[PDB]
Design a protein around this ligand. Structure first.
Ligand SMILES: CNC(=O)[C@H](Cc1ccncc1)NC(=O)[C@@H]1C[C@@H](C2CCCCC2)CN1C(=O)C[C@H](N)c1ccccc1OC
Length: 184
């Protein structure tokens, strides 16, 4: 899957305004306050969420994310069509294919309802693989020899798809650290 590597740039036009993106659009973290930026149609308004600029219409695509020091986060892909504005449940039923950590050490897949995961090694790095034609998205524990964390299959897929990130909420005080997309 390593050879299907893709270079992803976070899109500030989708970014929830509490989010702070590094200049190179390779890092995202949650600010202590809220940016003043357009209320445009792509912007996630309710939750600290951001997409990659990239759209996947076909083919196989792979990337990695550092989560070192983080008590919560959310990673995966979603339909370009997913709703941006207002409250919703993160799941395949809303057109997102994600896993997450919340409340330090509780890992779960975004099934409806959510599936708790039994991991042997807390991941410091997460790999995300998309096979469009096979309607598949899978999550590997880079820290544990690239062991499969979880796989969504028979996803079908018709629209364009988007990479998806949240550095999580900081209700904790201790989730300040950013997500980082690893150079590969
Ligand atoms: C709390 N309900 C849940 O089961 C999960 C839990 C969850 C936590 C973390 N990662 C994924 C899932 N929440 C959601 O699906 C969404 C996304 C979530 C975000 C995502 C990453 C940034 C920080 C947290 C916060 N969340 C809501 O708050 C929903 C919300 N409560 C709501 C859903 C419907 C109808 C009215 C409604 O509230 C008005």
């Amino acid at each position: 899957h390593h050879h299907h590597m893709v270079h992803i740039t976070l899109d500030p036009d989708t970014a929830n305004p509490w989010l702070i993106l590094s200049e190179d659009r390779r890092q995202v973290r949650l600010g202590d306050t809220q940016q003043s930026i357009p209320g445009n149609e792509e912007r996630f308004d309710s939750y600290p969420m951001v997409l990659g600029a990239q759209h996947f219409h076909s083919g196989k695509h792979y990337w990695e994310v550092d989560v070192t020091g983080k008590e919560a986060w959310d990673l995966g892909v979603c339909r370009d069509s997913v709703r941006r504005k207002g409250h919703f449940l993160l799941s395949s039923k809303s057109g997102f294919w994600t896993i997450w950590l919340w409340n330090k050490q509780k890992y779960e897949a975004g099934t409806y309802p959510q599936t708790p995961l039994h991991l042997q090694v807390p991941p410091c790095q997460v790999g995300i693989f998309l096979d469009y034609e096979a309607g598949m998205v899978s999550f590997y524990n880079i820290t544990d020899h690239g062991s499969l964390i979880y796989s969504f299959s028979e996803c079908a897929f018709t629209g364009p798809l988007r990479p998806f990130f949240s550095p999580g909420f900081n209700d904790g005080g201790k989730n300040t650290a950013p997500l980082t997309l690893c150079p590969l």
